[PDB]
Each structure stands twice: as C-alpha cells, then as structure tokens.
C-alpha cells in the first residue's frame, strides 16, 4: 500500500463535498465577491450549530 514518509499528501476525503457546497452556491447566486461570499457562506454554515 504505502511507500514511505518521504512524501504523503493524498487528496484528503470529504474535501469535495465541502468545496461543492460553496462552489455550487456561488453560481446559483453569482455573487460579486469571493472573499466576502466565502466568509459569509462558511461562517454561517458553522454557526448553524447550537
């Protein structure tokens, strides 16, 4: 399986669904800012808890 500690990055799992949520939302609404729309989309998502 593995090879060695010389190099180990491998595209982590779940990263696809995380970016999709943001990505798919950017097109559906087509916002003017990415930096803003990013913190606006990510923070809210998290805060959703409790």
């Amino acid at each position: 399986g593995a090879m060695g500690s010389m190099s180990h990055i491998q595209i982590p799992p779940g990263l696809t669904e995380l970016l999709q949520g943001y990505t798919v939302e950017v097109l559906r609404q087509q916002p003017p800012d990415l930096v803003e729309f990013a913190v606006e989309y990510f923070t809210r998502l998290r805060e959703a808890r409790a």
Partner: protein
C-alpha cells in the same frame, strides 16, 4: 511541462500545488452538475 506558460509563484511547495489544483478542478466540474439538474 504540459501547458504552464505562466507561473503562480508567491508561495506553496511543489507537490502541494499540483495536488491542490486538482481538488478545485474536481469540485468545480462537479458543482456544475448540481446546477445542470436545476
């Protein structure tokens, strides 16, 4: 080489750049499907 005429630079190692670029291309080509299906 392949088609990298320019150069991002600024930061980020090597293998870390090639990989991260794939992740965005994948999720980008994917989210588009979520749209194609309205």
């Amino acid at each position: 080489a392949m088609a990298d005429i320019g150069s991002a630079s600024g930061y980020v190692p090597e293998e870390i750049w090639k990989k991260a670029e794939e992740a965005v291309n994948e999720v980008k080509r994917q989210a588009m499907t979520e749209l194609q299906k309205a």
